[PDB]
From a paper:
The tardigrade damage suppressor (Dsup) and vertebrate high-mobility group N (HMGN) proteins bind specifically to nucleosomes via a conserved motif whose structure has not been experimentally determined. Here we used cryo-EM to show that both proteins bind to the nucleosome acidic patch via analogous arginine anchors with one molecule bound to each face of the nucleosome.
To this end, we collected data from a cross-linked HMGN2–nucleosome sample containing human HMGN2 and a 5S rDNA nucleosome with 10 bp of linker DNA at each end. The map shows density for one full wrap of DNA around the histone octamer but lacks signal for the 10 bp linkers and most of the outer turns, which suggests high DNA flexibility. Under our experimental conditions, the data analysis shows two HMGN2 molecules bound to the nucleosome, one on each face of the nucleosome at the acidic patch. Unexpectedly, however, our analysis revealed asymmetry between the two nucleosome-bound HMGN2 molecules. Because HMGN proteins can bind to the nucleosome cooperatively, it is possible that the binding of one HMGN2 molecule affects the affinity or positioning of the second molecule at the acidic patch, leading to distinct HMGN2–histone H2A interactions.
Author numbering:
A (entry chain B), F (entry chain F): 21 to 102
B (entry chain A), G (entry chain E): 37 to 135
C (entry chain D), H (entry chain H): 31 to 123
D (entry chain K): 22 to 26
E (entry chain C), I (entry chain G): 15 to 117
J (entry chain L): 22 to 27
The structure:
DNA sequence: ACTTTCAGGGTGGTATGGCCGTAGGCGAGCACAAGGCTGACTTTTCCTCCCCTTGTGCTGCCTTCTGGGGGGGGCCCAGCTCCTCCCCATGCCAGGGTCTT
DNA sequence: AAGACCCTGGCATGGGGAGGAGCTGGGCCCCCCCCAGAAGGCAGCACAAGGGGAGGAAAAGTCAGCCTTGTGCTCGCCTACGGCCATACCACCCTGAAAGT
């Protein structure tokens, strides 16, 4: 069933994200923390993106719904339409 | 025995390699499954454009990279190089996300 | 000079509904007025964008209801929507 | 008189 | 009966409609839009006023002051999120000391 | 009002501000840092308030000019109108 | 010799006293002089409403109190009770005022 | 028959002005489109609020100029204001 | 000639005028408002393109990719301040490492 | 043929 | 490369905005005091910063199996477009109730 | 308490959006295969953390001084209001061309 896919954000993937941020040494408890942070961020944007989608009485979440949900969240994304 | 690099220089090697590149650092299919699973809790039988999931991934990865920069700053403040969950919590709290 | 109008009369009426024996000072009433103006501009501004996204020239109660959902967090949105939906139902009836 | 939550 | 009376509100349904039309948020404004907005604004105000009045009673006072409004907003996490970037003039801060600083 | 008016933010004044923030011990180099931080914040808000006033062809910086400048800064302030 | 409190108890008493109150903690005349000195660099011969200066003072004081709370968190992070300039700098950097 | 709105032609002309021998990718060009759409919405929104505050029903080059001053920081606003006035002077004359 | 060419720009003065009128910003739009906005939009584009184009030349390339725009934006303090809360897709980050980092 | 500030 | 939908021009009207004139009201400035707040000095004590030692937790290298990713194909549900027309929102005239001084 | 005026009512009207029908496009699902990478493990070592100690820099108390703040008055410059009138912008008719698929 579609459950526990947050483990698909593997330890090597988080290390790559941390390495791009300049981190050298990463504690073992970081990976559970980063997964909890990402889930909260995704839940926030997806909630607003779906709200835009049901407003237009649509069933497919467009790239522009995500851009609108991000922009209202505070973060503006360039390269997917305006 | 074969040569073994001193612990730490491989970290700078990876830092340079992953800061020079702009590719997405999370596998696309696991992230797509995660996005579809989160959105299932809001509305059932949803559909996603490919660019929708691409935009979600780009936003999430940029956000995580910025958060890790802030966490690294918090770690350096405490006279450390190993980032810990308390560093993430402090960076988020000063950023106003914990409220 | 011209006269200035705000929500002071209605805020007093709402306060009397919840707390019959509690007053409100002048400085507190000024803050309540600024709070109502702030939320009105937030909801209307979001509903303006929301209607323009769908190429709509009209702002309806659907636009307000979704603007409430986007802005009000958690159970604040849930209860506000029910109050807003109940009021509109009573108004049309 | 008035209360919701 | 005034428009607010029909909707059961104590807020200006008519004046909000004038505000919606005046603010050029759209070319046209629906009939039920002012009624929905006035109900939301009244509900939010009543929510704060009940919380602020409770704070005044806790502070054994019979009048609401901006400090009481600040206590109500910051204590409720739902209103705190809504008004996260809002400054209340003469509101002070929530009384809170970190445990590690205490003896 | 010509110069050296930042020193009007005296050391006891900054200490009272820190106490409201829950600070127990304050370093001796904090006061100079707090004065510079305050000055930068005031310059940003005043530049926006004066810009609003100059647009309306006025000479008196109204309280609404300050409220509008703060809202532009993302620092909404209640109690002075709106 | 008279009775002398141990250091820290008076600090806690001041913390409680100033967190229980809502007064302005900066003298009004020096702050007004500072505001007029700053504004004179943009437009000469300006005039200020009393409410304009009061709004400026309230905004500045709220901003400074919030910044000091963030600085206190940064100080506790480094295992300290004394707030230092580097704590303020880190709090400003994470907040975005210096990125 | 629905149109597609973009500044791709004009960005191409501007790019050929500053960098004669340099092209721009498809993804990079879509970034420039979002940037122009973003800044247009910022200045127009600021000019709208400036006209509303002074109870003006029109948006003039003075509203646009003040909006540029409020948004663009530092030497960006000084040069943007200078370029705008030079264009307007040429447009009328 | 055309309105754009009369002002001496490359951006569409006529297209900007419609967007200002259609976007519900004010009941009327002046004659010089679209001309002023087009001049500013063209200037801001030329600044980024010149900086981004220089990035490709220094990175021994010939075509601008989203990475070059990010390098130009984040390196310029004025452009960085204007676009502080803006994410550039496929932009990566600026290569920067702390001083305490290096042994 | 179009240069800007340094 | 073609076009057809948008760019550009001229004219009527009128609603918006500029210019003059005015009256008052608020903002800047000046005395005066008295005292509450500030600035400086001393003592000290308690926090900070440095050093050391160590044990644990992180890193680095290897091996192997798994699953992400790429190709190729098929369905069909959902999204976009055009006609119609019916119903809601707007504008104008008239009246009267309310909420601000 | 009075009344200025804005909200409500009634009616005529143009236009917007909602249903219906139709087409088609890509989102989803499947299958196969490969090899790049993740997961587990082991050896090593380096870093976080506790303990100890010196010193110096904040805190607390004391006291002398000063400059803030409350009260009162003057001047006069600015700002909101009102009226007159120019004029620039919107809508409509007409003609013509430009970049997007």
């Amino acid at each position: 069933v579609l459950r526990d896919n947050i483990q698909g954000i593997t330890k090597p993937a988080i290390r790559r994200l941390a390495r791009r941020g300049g981190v050298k040494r990463i504690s073992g408890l970081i990976y559970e923390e980063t997964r909890g942070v990402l889930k909260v961020f995704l839940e926030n944007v997806i909630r607003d993106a779906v709200t835009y989608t049901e407003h237009a009485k649509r069933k497919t979440v467009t790239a522009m719904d995500v851009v609108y949900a991000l922009k209202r969240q505070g973060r503006t994304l360039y390269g997917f339409g305006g | 025995k074969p040569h073994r690099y001193r612990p730490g220089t491989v970290a700078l090697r990876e830092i340079r390699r992953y800061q020079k590149s702009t590719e997405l650092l999370i596998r696309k299919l696991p992230f797509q499954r995660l996005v579809r699973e989160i959105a299932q809790d809001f509305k059932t039988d949803l559909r996603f454009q490919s660019s929708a999931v691409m935009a979600l991934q780009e936003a999430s990865e940029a956000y995580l990279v910025g958060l890790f920069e802030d966490t690294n700053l918090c770690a350096i403040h405490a006279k450390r190089v190993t980032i810990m969950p308390k560093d993430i919590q402090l960076a988020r709290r000063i950023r106003g996300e914990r409220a | 000079r011209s006269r200035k109008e705000s929500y002071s009369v209605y805020v007093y009426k709402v306060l009397k509904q919840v707390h019959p024996d509690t007053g409100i000072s002048s400085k507190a009433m000024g803050i309540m007025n600024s709070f109502v103006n702030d939320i009105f501009e937030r909801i209307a501004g979001e509903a303006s964008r929301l209607a323009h996204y769908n190429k709509r020239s009209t702002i309806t109660s659907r636009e307000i209801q979704t603007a409430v959902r986007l802005l009000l967090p958690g159970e604040l949105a849930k209860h506000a929507v029910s109050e807003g939906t109940k009021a509109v139902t009573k108004y049309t009836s | 008189r008035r209360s919701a939550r | 009966k005034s428009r607010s009376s029909r909707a059961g509100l104590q807020f200006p349904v008519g004046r909000v409609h004038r505000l919606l039309r005046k603010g050029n948020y759209a070319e046209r404004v629906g009939a039920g839009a002012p009624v929905y907005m006035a109900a939301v604004l009244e509900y939010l105000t009543a929510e704060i006023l009940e919380l602020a009045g409770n704070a005044a009673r806790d502070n054994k006072k019979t009048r609401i002051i901006p400090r009481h409004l600040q206590l109500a907003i910051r204590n409720d996490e739902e209103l705190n999120k809504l008004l996260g970037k809002v400054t209340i003039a003469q509101g002070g801060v929530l009384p809170n000391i970190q445990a590690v600083l205490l003896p």
